[PDB]
From a paper:
The point of convergence is the cleavage of the 186 kDa complement component 3 (C3) generating the C3b fragment (178 kDa) which becomes covalently associated with the activator surface. The C3bBb complex is the AP C3 convertase, which catalyzes further C3 cleavage. In contrast, properdin (FP) is a direct positive regulator of the AP and stabilizes the convertase by associating with C3b in the convertase and proconvertase, reviewed. FP oligomerizes prior to secretion, and in plasma it is found in a mass distribution with roughly 25% tetramers, 50% trimers and 25% dimers.
To obtain an improved understanding of the FP-C3bBb interaction we here also obtained diffraction data extending to 6.2 Å resolution for the complex between C3bBb, SCIN, FPcΔ3, and the FP specific non-inhibitory nanobody hFPNb1. Although the resolution was low for both FP-convertase structures, the quality of the electron densities calculated without FP contribution was good due to high solvent contents, 2-fold non-crystallographic symmetry and multi crystal averaging between the two crystal forms. We then fitted the relevant parts of the FPc structure into the electron densities of both C3bBb-SCIN complexes and the structure of hFPNb1 determined at 1.3 Å resolution into the hFPNb1-FPcΔ3-C3bBb-SCIN complex. With respect to the hFPNb1-FPΔ3-C3bBb-SCIN structure, TSR2 could be modeled in one of the two complexes. The epitope of the hFPNb1 nanobody appears be located within residues 267–281 at the end of FP TSR4 located close to TSR5 and the TB domain, and all three complementarity determining regions (CDRs) seem to contribute to the paratope. One proof of the reliability of our convertase-FP structures was obtained when we mutated three residues in the hFPNb1 CDR3 predicted from the hFPNb1-FPcΔ3-C3bBb-SCIN structure to be important for FP recognition. Affinity measurements for the FP-hFPNb1 interaction performed with bio-layer interferometry (BLI) demonstrated that hFPNb1 had been placed in an overall correct position in the electron density at 6.2 Å resolution. There are small differences between the four copies of the C3bBb-FP complex present in the two crystal forms. They differ by 3° rotation of the Bb von Willebrand type A (vWA) domain relative to C3b and by 7° rotation of FP relative to C3b, but crystal packing may contribute.
Numbering used by the authors:
A (entry chain B): 1257 to 1304
B (entry chain A): 1 to 645
C (entry chain B): 776 to 1064
D (entry chain G): 324 to 538
């Protein structure tokens, strides 16, 4: 029961690497999603 | 043998100084003390510094300090409780205790140049970064700006090191924006779970040229008033001249969070000499509600909405007064500053907190105990009245009921409150107590306060009491501690305490004695009391006019701003039109709200006393542990226990 | 600007801390002035009324005022370069008078409007120049382009996913206006897969003082050692009692001190030093230690 | 305009000259400017031990206290100001000698009064504290106190305050009205037949200043 906890199983396995290809395309916006940013919002704005 | 003792607060904080007070009782000769802080659970060793020697020349006292670092290993767990272990080795005998830890590291205050902005305008904002002592600290801050439905649109990360705790920053509002309430949220890098916030509004406006004040005669309504609620209107231009116009005013009822409007309460009054007056009668209010009972109206609240237009017809201001209670009682009595624990057979002091129905403190209202009409007293400036009883040695709880005696008001209008106090439990029912008594005044820095220590015990053991041990808790840390010696026959001793600026806004004094009594058993008896201090600045910044004449200067004129303040201080400025504040005066920062935030961060939960010596320290916010075995109750919750209410 | 200003001052001292000063009020005023009260925004090419209010705060003197709306290339009115739009009014003392004018916006943007006034028989005058936004007809729309799920294991096959977003067709768009595209990403919070641990109510008995022979010292030390490790990882010391881990630490340290007393000189264990060494007990202590 | 070495004048004018042996004693120190006007917020301290310091209130009165030993010898009390920047030649001082209370037959049974020191306005309450000191064989015989108020040369109010055994301290609130202006004296006493069957009276008194205003 201690080893059942300690390193307890959990449903999270987030390891997402998401990148965007811009219309201006001077650089590629790239972020990462893990457990500490599971409920974190990531937003970007354009003017066109 | 002598008994070794360690006193510390209940809760320790990251990134701040923590006071550690070491004492030995009944000790002979010098005893070296080494100090160590470990982690909990397990052993990784987080702090191994500091040592001292308890000396009989110093009455075996020794205060040493330390600081808790935080790293990636400490900041790991963010959601659930974690603890550390304090180790102090007195000669060859070690005393240790597990302590609860808070992850908070200081305070963040955010000032904005306006409380409400237009699309396409600039927001100027300064973030003041202070520690728990309200002194400027240099740390990295994470700030975020969120939308009305909670979407972060702009975020920053910057350290205030070598900038004297000030982060001046800027951001431009786009014209493509959703109007409504916008929120700025901020937190330190090393404390991500402690989130600070302040709000502002985005709207499409132009500033008005005048302000409208809606003034109820009394800030409540008494249901059986045949005349009804009178609300005076005051309207004047922003530069201070009287407004001539016509006001349209309508009343309404607020029940919980939902507002109900009374349509036929509408009146139309001209505003003459900068003023008007409107009355909502008792018949119209009862005609508005469909419930003909006056008893069900109690507990709800009223609101007023006014719309005033000048007689030129070129400008318009809408004002609102809200939260006006419908009550049977023009006062609210609370035992919030009264301890719930009495000393049996020793007189007990009552501090009665009386407020107006909105929550503002009541001034010079006479209250009395329900038992015996002879004991009466009037409230002071802060709404506190002083009453006292002469307690019998009842081991049964003592019910205390206080009722006001203000003249002309009927008995249905006299407020009352009923509580039940609890008896102090001595060790082994030895009936040996400690009683504290003190003056009750508004305390300013620079005054002295006489602390009175009364001993109660049999005279066979009074010669064994040679000292008292006192400590001062202020803002969640130990500020001062020491010994007060006592010669035999001196059951009462007096200690003058000088008030400095460090004691603001409130502090608790604890005191105890110890001996081996009864059948050869170690006994600890303690007492505590909570004292309020007048809310003021630690420093003294004043802004005034340099010129003494040319009242109302011309637009664009040069004038001299005179600034008197503490030497070495950095001051920030902003000058705002008051018409912004007539539109939206919410979320304005002030010094009184700063001390209110500090008081909400206090770890003490009771105005003094306790069920025993352990309950005295635990309710004050202190931990004690002795080498003989007597120690405080375990506490694993940061917040205070909630009253039954 | 003619108003009373409220100045907020906050000081920061390295020894006297933060101090928010009491606000200082400065009333700036002129005896005769104009206040032109524009709306925040106006519809382009629709005739609108502006309200210029002129104030007289003499206690016993009414004033003859010539007030004039100036010519504007961005706003059509009666004011041209040849022919000016001027009026002659009279303001009673301790009173205000409003002079309406009518104008038409001609071009979009934050454009300039200027008015002036001057009194006869005294040389006191005022002028007000403000700017207000000329907005083309139309309204804000915040429509949604797409809302879809991202899962590279599920979509696109074998951990790689590609997905496009077309721009909005927006045929109702006002010509030559800004149009933001707000992109948002939020992960999926997944939790549970944890069963309940033992509530540590009846686990308060396993604290046993080690005593006796070497095997018997291992029997008494057996439930004390494992219970601390279980309560560490289940973090149930809140219900159990934080003081009892330090008390159990003394019993675990007392068990290990008593366990080393039955050690054979060839690093082996038995009930007594006289007894032949036990292979199973030697493996069990290594499991415990 | 005085030519002085001292910018202040220290007086024991509001301090009683008689102490209670073995029971702590209160000092009310009246400090003035050289013309005679009261000094505001000047810190004074006892000459013995630098730790006991206090600043004057609005009426020029500072509160100091000692923890007295049972000396039947008179006790010399010297008070010295501790105001910063000013030199020791500029620090005022005053020296007096207080006298011991004599109990009936040297029975060492005393009465001690103690009270708050504030500017008193009409409508405020004032807590009067009565401390009994005697052996416990005669503490059960003291069942009451007798108090009287002297104001403007006539008795204004008087009464009894009862006491139960074991309650050596009792508290009596006193509401201040306009009759107490400008100054009044409170006296209190108890009585019993103690020692070898002898009538004993023990009393104590204090003078209180009231804020000068209209009735
Ligand atoms: C368009 O923008 C509006 C804001 O201008 C948003 O709708 C608002 O949603 C909040 C709740 O979070 C309501 O309190 C407001 O009343 C809504 N505004 C309205 C209805 O004008 C949302 O982003 C978009 N809404 C629509 C209907 O398109
Ligand atoms: C704990 O010890 C420190 C020693 O650093 C004390 O600080 C000194 O206190 C004395 C007397 O109060 C002052 O005269 C010194 O100026 C202080 N030191 C410094 C560097 O300023 C501290 O007061 C002690 N606190 C307690 C509660 O005992
Ligand atoms: C002495 O006796 C007189 C009786 O004339 C008392 O005067 C009355 O006191 C009571 C209680 O204080 C009041 O309720 C009455 O209103 C008083 N009488 C009048 C006519 O006003 C007086 O208080 C007593 N004084 C003392 C010191 O005992």
């Amino acid at each position: 029961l201690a080893q059942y906890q300690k390193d307890a199983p959990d449903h999270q396995e987030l390891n997402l690497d998401v990148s965007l290809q811009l219309p201006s395309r001077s650089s590629k916006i790239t972020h990462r999603i893990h457990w500490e940013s599971a409920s974190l919002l990531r937003s970007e704005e354009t003017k066109e | 043998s002598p008994m070794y003792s360690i006193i510390t607060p209940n809760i320790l904080r990251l990134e701040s100084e923590e006071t550690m007070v070491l004492e030995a009782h009944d000790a002979q000769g010098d005893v070296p003390v080494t100090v160590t802080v470990h982690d909990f659970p397990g052993k990784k060793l987080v702090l191994s510094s500091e040592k001292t020697v308890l000396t009989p020349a110093t009455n075996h006292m020794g205060n040493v300090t330390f600081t808790i670092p935080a790293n990636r290993e400490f900041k790991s767990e963010k959601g659930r409780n974690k603890f550390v272990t304090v180790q102090a080795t007195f000669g060859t005998q070690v005393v240790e205790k597990v302590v609860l830890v808070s992850l908070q590291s200081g305070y963040l205050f955010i000032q904005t140049d306006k409380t409400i902005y237009t699309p396409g305008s600039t927001v100027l904002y300064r973030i003041f970064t202070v520690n728990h002592k309200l002194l400027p600290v240099g740390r990295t801050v994470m700030v975020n700006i969120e939308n009305p439905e909670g979407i972060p649109v702009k975020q920053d990360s910057l350290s205030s090191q070598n900038q004297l705790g000030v982060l001046p920053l800027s951001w431009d509002i786009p014209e493509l924006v959703n109007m409504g309430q916008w929120k700025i949220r901020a937190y330190y890098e090393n404390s991500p779970q402690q989130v600070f916030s302040t709000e502002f509004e985005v709207k499409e406006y132009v500033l008005p040229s005048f302000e409208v004040i809606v003034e109820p005669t009394e800030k409540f309504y008494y249901i059986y008033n045949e005349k009804g609620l009178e609300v005076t209107i005051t309207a004047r231009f922003l530069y201070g001249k009287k407004v001539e116009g016509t006001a349209f005013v309508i009343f309404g009822i607020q029940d919980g969070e939902q507002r109900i409007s009374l349509p036929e309460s509408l009146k139309r009054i001209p505003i003459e000499d900068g003023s008007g007056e409107v009355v909502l009668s008792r018949k119209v209010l009862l005609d508005g509600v469909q419930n003909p009972r006056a008893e069900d109206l109690v507990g709800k609240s009223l609101y007023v909405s006014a719309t005033v237009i000048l007689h030129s017809g070129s400008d318009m201001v809408q004002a609102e007064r809200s939260g006006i209670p419908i009550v049977t009682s023009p006062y609210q009595i609370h035992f919030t500053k009264t301890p719930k624990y009495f000393k049996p057979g020793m007189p007990f002091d009552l501090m009665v907190f009386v407020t107006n129905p909105d929550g503002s403190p009541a001034y010079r209202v006479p209250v009395a105990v329900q038992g015996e009409d002879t004991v009466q007293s009037l409230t002071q400036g802060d709404g506190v009245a002083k009453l006292s009883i002469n307690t019998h040695p009842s081991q049964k709880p003592l019910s205390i009921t206080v009722r006001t005696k203000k003249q002309e008001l009927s008995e249905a209008e006299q407020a009352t409150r009923t509580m039940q106090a609890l008896p102090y439990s001595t060790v082994g029912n030895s009936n040996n107590y400690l009683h504290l008594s003190v003056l009750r005044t508004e305390l300013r820095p620079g005054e002295t306060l006489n602390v009175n220590f009364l001993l109660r015990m049999d005279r066979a053991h009074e010669a064994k009491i040679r000292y008292y041990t006192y400590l001062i808790m202020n803002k969640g840390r130990l500020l001062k501690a020491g010994r007060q010696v006592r010669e035999p026959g001196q059951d009462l001793v007096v200690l003058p305490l000088s008030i400095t600026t460090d004691f603001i806004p409130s502090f608790r004094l604890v005191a105890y004695y110890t001996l081996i009594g009864a059948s050869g058993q170690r006994e600890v008896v303690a007492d505590s009391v909570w004292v309020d201090v007048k809310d003021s600045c630690v420093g003294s910044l004043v802004v005034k006019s340099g010129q003494s004449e040319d009242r109302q200067p011309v637009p664009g004129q040069q004038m001299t701003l005179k600034i008197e303040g503490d030497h070495g201080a950095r001051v920030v400025l902003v000058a705002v039109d008051k018409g912004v504040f007539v539109l939206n005066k919410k979320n304005k920062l002030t010094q009184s709200k700063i001390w209110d935030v500090v008081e909400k961060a206090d770890i003490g939960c009771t105005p003094g006393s306790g069920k025993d010596y352990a309950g005295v320290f635990s309710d004050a916010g202190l931990t004690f542990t002795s080498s003989s075995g007597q120690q405080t109750a375990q506490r694993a919750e940061l917040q205070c226990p909630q009253p039954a209410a | 600007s003619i108003t009373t200003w409220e100045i907020l001052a906050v000081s920061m001292s390295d020894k006297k801390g933060i101090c928010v000063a009491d606000p200082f009020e400065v009333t700036v005023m002129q005896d005769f002035f104009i206040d032109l009260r524009l709306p925040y925004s106006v519809v382009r090419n629709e005739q609108v009324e502006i309200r210029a209010v002129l104030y007289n705060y003499r206690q016993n003197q009414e004033l003859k005022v010539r007030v004039e709306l100036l010519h504007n290339p961005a706003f059509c009115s009666l004011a041209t370069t040849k022919r000016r739009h001027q009026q002659t009014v009279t303001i009673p003392p301790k009173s205000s008078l409003s002079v309406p004018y009518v104008i038409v916006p001609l071009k979009t943007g934050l454009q300039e409007v200027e008015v002036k006034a001057a009194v006869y028989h005294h040389f006191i005058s005022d002028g007000v120049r403000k700017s207000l936004k000329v907005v083309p007809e139309g309204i804000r729309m915040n429509k949604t382009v797409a809302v879809r799920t991202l899962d590279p294991e599920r979509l696109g096959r074998e951990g790689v996913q590609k997905e496009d977003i077309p721009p909005a067709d927006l045929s109702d768009q006002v010509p030559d206006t800004e149009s933001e595209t707000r992109i948002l990403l939020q992960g999926t919070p997944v939790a549970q897969m944890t069963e309940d641990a033992v509530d540590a109510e009846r686990l308060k008995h396993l604290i046993v003082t080690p005593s006796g022979c070497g095997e018997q010292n291992m029997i008494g030390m057996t439930p004390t050692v494992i219970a601390v490790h279980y309560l560490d990882e289940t973090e149930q010391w809140e219900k159990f009692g934080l003081e009892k881990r330090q008390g159990a630490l003394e019993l675990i340290k007392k068990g290990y001190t008593q366990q080393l007393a039955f050690r054979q000189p060839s690093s082996a264990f038995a009930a007594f030093v006289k007894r032949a060494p036990s292979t199973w007990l030697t493996a069990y202590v290594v499991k415990v230690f």
